Design an enzyme around this catalytic site. Structure first.
Site, PDB file in Angstrom:
ATOM      1  N   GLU A 175       0.981  -1.269  -0.117  1.00 33.21           N
ATOM      2  CA  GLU A 175      -0.035   0.207  -0.035  1.00 33.21           C
ATOM      3  C   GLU A 175       0.892   1.287  -0.039  1.00 33.21           C
ATOM      4  O   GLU A 175       0.552   2.041   1.029  1.00 33.21           O
ATOM      5  CB  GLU A 175      -0.873   0.059   1.078  1.00 33.21           C
ATOM      6  CG  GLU A 175      -1.898  -1.328   1.042  1.00 33.21           C
ATOM      7  CD  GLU A 175      -3.155  -1.137   1.840  1.00 33.21           C
ATOM      8  OE1 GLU A 175      -3.447  -0.505   2.502  1.00 33.21           O
ATOM      9  OE2 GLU A 175      -3.923  -2.219   1.388  1.00 33.21           O
ATOM     10  N   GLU A 191      -4.087  -8.794  -1.512  1.00 35.08           N
ATOM     11  CA  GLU A 191      -4.526  -8.747  -0.191  1.00 35.08           C
ATOM     12  C   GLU A 191      -5.978  -8.412  -0.181  1.00 35.08           C
ATOM     13  O   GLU A 191      -6.400  -7.086  -0.622  1.00 35.08           O
ATOM     14  CB  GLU A 191      -3.726  -7.786   0.803  1.00 35.08           C
ATOM     15  CG  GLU A 191      -4.164  -7.614   2.115  1.00 35.08           C
ATOM     16  CD  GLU A 191      -3.722  -6.503   2.812  1.00 35.08           C
ATOM     17  OE1 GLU A 191      -2.707  -5.959   2.350  1.00 35.08           O
ATOM     18  OE2 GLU A 191      -4.202  -6.133   3.856  1.00 35.08           O
TER      19      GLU A 191
HETATM   20  C1  LIG Z   1      -4.069  -4.594   4.518  1.00 40.93           C
HETATM   21  C2  LIG Z   1      -2.718  -4.591   5.167  1.00 40.93           C
HETATM   22  O1  LIG Z   1      -1.585  -5.071   4.271  1.00 40.93           O
HETATM   23  C3  LIG Z   1      -2.557  -5.453   6.509  1.00 40.93           C
HETATM   24  O2  LIG Z   1      -1.460  -5.499   6.979  1.00 40.93           O
HETATM   25  C4  LIG Z   1      -3.922  -5.015   7.320  1.00 40.93           C
HETATM   26  O3  LIG Z   1      -4.071  -5.923   8.502  1.00 40.93           O
HETATM   27  C5  LIG Z   1      -3.949  -5.454   9.833  1.00 40.93           C
HETATM   28  C6  LIG Z   1      -3.668  -6.249  10.944  1.00 40.93           C
HETATM   29  N1  LIG Z   1      -3.719  -7.784  10.691  1.00 40.93           N
HETATM   30  C7  LIG Z   1      -3.300  -8.701  11.194  1.00 40.93           C
HETATM   31  O4  LIG Z   1      -2.307  -8.789  12.008  1.00 40.93           O
HETATM   32  C8  LIG Z   1      -3.976 -10.184  11.216  1.00 40.93           C
HETATM   33  F1  LIG Z   1      -3.493 -10.755  10.246  1.00 40.93           F
HETATM   34  F2  LIG Z   1      -5.351 -10.048  10.843  1.00 40.93           F
HETATM   35  F3  LIG Z   1      -4.002 -10.927  12.067  1.00 40.93           F
HETATM   36  C9  LIG Z   1      -4.993  -5.239   6.636  1.00 40.93           C
HETATM   37  C10 LIG Z   1      -6.253  -4.710   7.395  1.00 40.93           C
HETATM   38  O5  LIG Z   1      -6.506  -3.455   7.411  1.00 40.93           O
HETATM   39  O6  LIG Z   1      -7.093  -5.454   8.065  1.00 40.93           O
HETATM   40  C11 LIG Z   1      -5.014  -4.188   5.129  1.00 40.93           C
HETATM   41  O7  LIG Z   1      -5.101  -2.876   5.564  1.00 40.93           O
END
Ligand SMILES: *[C@@H]1[C@H](O)[C@@H](O)[C@H](OCCNC(=O)C(F)(F)F)[C@@H](C(=O)O)[C@H]1O
Ligand SMILES: *[C@@H]1O[C@H](CO)[C@@H](O)[C@H](O)[C@H]1NC(C)=O
Ligand SMILES: *[C@@H]1O[C@H](CO)[C@@H](O)[C@H](O)[C@H]1NC(C)=O
Ligand SMILES: *[C@@H]1O[C@H](CO)[C@@H](O)[C@H](O)[C@H]1NC(C)=O
EC number: 3.2.1.166
Lengths: 74, 384
Positions: free
Chosen positions: B66, B184
């Site tokens: 992103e 993603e």
């Molecule tokens: C896309 C981004 O690349 C993700 O890192 C982000 O997820 C946030 C936290 N997620 C976790 O730790 C997990 F895996 F779910 F346990 C996501 C999002 O916003 O959910 C997205 O922006």
């Protein structure tokens, strides 16, 4: 009534997806979990993962851009 | 968001997980390591590349996640042109490595809003030539505000179509023919929607996303996440599979790579959603020419689907998914044709049992449900 007629197009494939079309991520953040090693070690989790084969596994997340490789660290 | 280091130990755990699970690892490199003049400083990555090649690790690469929100995330702005240049630098390092045929994917931009569209178009002008796939990300909802009504709303499902068309507009105008991947994707960002992203209710968005992705020319969909803190995990904290794991396993066993089309006769075609592929031939029970139909009913009553000529009297296997009570669409447990889906043991996935329907019968699909139907001996040449 609740009867619904389907139309089907079957003359040729409109697209070809990868055998790996349905793929998965592990968030880059999970490499900051103390228990990371136990979690991906899990026989049970391996069984579930193997059921989605073939698939890409993307190791990536927000934390992708805050992770530095240390050839030293244990 | 602070920096963190990780060890060769971590690279080894990740890689053997992937390797021993029959999955193809894609590793995202830090793109926020810059030089004085905001070029990509590649020496850390050059290290990880060395270590990986030494160990015989077959790995595909990404650079950044992103990039469109680096200013918000790190008060650094990088434009598409520079990022394209950064990707050409990485391609070089890969060509001069031991897997010189290693794949590179990018740029893992968020959904195509005007600022992100501009970023992706300039990224592809500049770095388009060196990526093997264009990755972008989609989420339907904000995990913090999403409601159960949103998860069931076909106006919410429909927005994904527009997003897909905008991405294909940028790509056709800079790199016609390049593969487009969801790098993603999930119901809801911010880690998912508590009591929704992990339930049977999550399956409407997931199955619809897959159906529309296939139909509209997306080659690969990457589900946020297989496992993690996020409510959108296919597998929960106790390594137990949630309804989306099972949906995913069913899809994987029944749906082929050859995408066809299905549609409902009429002007209401919003709440009853239909998708058609060639049956997965590796499925031992089915043969060349068979069709897999899948269908989502967001009506609040059963609908009865009639197959068109010449498929009207064919043998059909039903694979209907339905929540195990008492929590209805908010359940974390699902039944296949009235049989609860549970691992047999830590090592053993259960069988996924068909329910052969009477040849000539209409396809019953209850309210708030989804099902697969395999049309046996359809003899569709385009499949064979
Ligand atoms: C896309 C981004 O690349 C993700 O890192 C982000 O997820 C946030 C936290 N997620 C976790 O730790 C997990 F895996 F779910 F346990 C996501 C999002 O916003 O959910 C997205 O922006
Ligand atoms: C890139 O980073 C490494 C240390 O982090 C250093 O050796 C190299 O000189 C850097 N280049 C820059 C900041 O331009
Ligand atoms: C994009 O950023 C680069 C690197 O910072 C800069 O030199 C250039 O002026 C910008 N390019 C465009 C087309 O705006
Ligand atoms: C069912 O959906 C209709 C729309 O077809 C709606 O107006 C009605 O109030 C809903 N509930 C039931 C059980 O009929």
């Amino acid at each position: 009534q609740d009867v619904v007629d389907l139309d089907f197009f079957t003359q040729e494939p409109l697209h070809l997806v990868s055998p790996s079309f349905l793929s998965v991520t592990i968030d880059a953040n999970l490499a900051t979990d103390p228990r990371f090693l136990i979690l991906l070690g899990s026989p049970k989790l391996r069984t579930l993962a193997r059921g989605l084969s073939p698939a890409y596994l993307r190791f990536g997340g927000t934390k992708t851009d805050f992770l530095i490789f240390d050839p030293k660290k244990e | 968001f602070k920096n963190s280091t990780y060890s060769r130990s971590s690279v080894d755990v990740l890689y053997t997980f992937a390797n021993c699970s029959g999955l193809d690892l894609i590793f995202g490199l830090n793109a926020l390591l810059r030089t004085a003049d905001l070029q990509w400083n590649s020496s850390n990555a050059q290290l990880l590349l060395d270590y990986c090649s030494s160990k015989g690790y077959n790995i595909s690469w990404e650079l950044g996640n992103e990039p469109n929100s680096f200013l918000k995330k790190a008060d650094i702005f990088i434009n598409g042109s520079q990022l394209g240049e950064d990707f050409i630098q990485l391609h070089k390092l890969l060509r001069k490595s031991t897997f010189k045929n290693a794949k590179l994917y990018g740029p893992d931009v968020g959904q195509p809003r005007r600022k992100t569209a501009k970023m992706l178009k300039s990224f592809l002008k500049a770095g388009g030539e060196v990526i093997d796939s264009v990755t972008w990300h989609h989420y339907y909802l904000n995990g913090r505000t999403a409601t159960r009504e949103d998860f069931l709303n076909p106006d919410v499902l429909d927005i994904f179509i527009s997003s897909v068309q905008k991405v294909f507009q940028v790509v056709e105008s800079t790199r016609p023919g390049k593969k487009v991947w969801l790098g993603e994707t999930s119901s809801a960002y911010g880690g998912g929607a508590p009591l929704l992203s992990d339930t049977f209710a999550a399956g409407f968005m997931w199955l619809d996303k897959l159906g529309l992705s296939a139909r509209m020319g997306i080659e690969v969909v990457m589900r946020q996440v297989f496992f993690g803190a996020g409510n959108y995990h296919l597998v929960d904290e106790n390594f137990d599979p949630l309804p989306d794991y099972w949906l995913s396993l069913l899809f994987k066993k029944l749906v082929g790579t050859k995408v066809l089309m299905a549609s409902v006769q009429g002007s209401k075609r919003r709440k009853l959603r239909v998708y058609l592929h060639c049956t997965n031939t590796d499925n031992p029970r089915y043969k060349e020419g068979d069709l897999t139909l899948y269908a989502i009913n967001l009506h609040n009553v059963t609908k009865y689907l009639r197959l068109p000529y010449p498929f009207s009297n064919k043998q059909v296997d039903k694979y209907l998914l339905r929540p195990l009570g008492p929590h209805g669409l908010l359940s974390k447990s699902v039944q296949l044709n009235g049989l609860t889906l549970k691992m047999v043991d830590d090592q053993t996935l259960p069988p996924l049992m068909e329910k052969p329907l009477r040849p000539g019968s209409s396809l019953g699909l209850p309210a708030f449900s989804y099902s697969f139907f395999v049309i046996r001996n359809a003899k569709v040449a385009a499949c064979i």
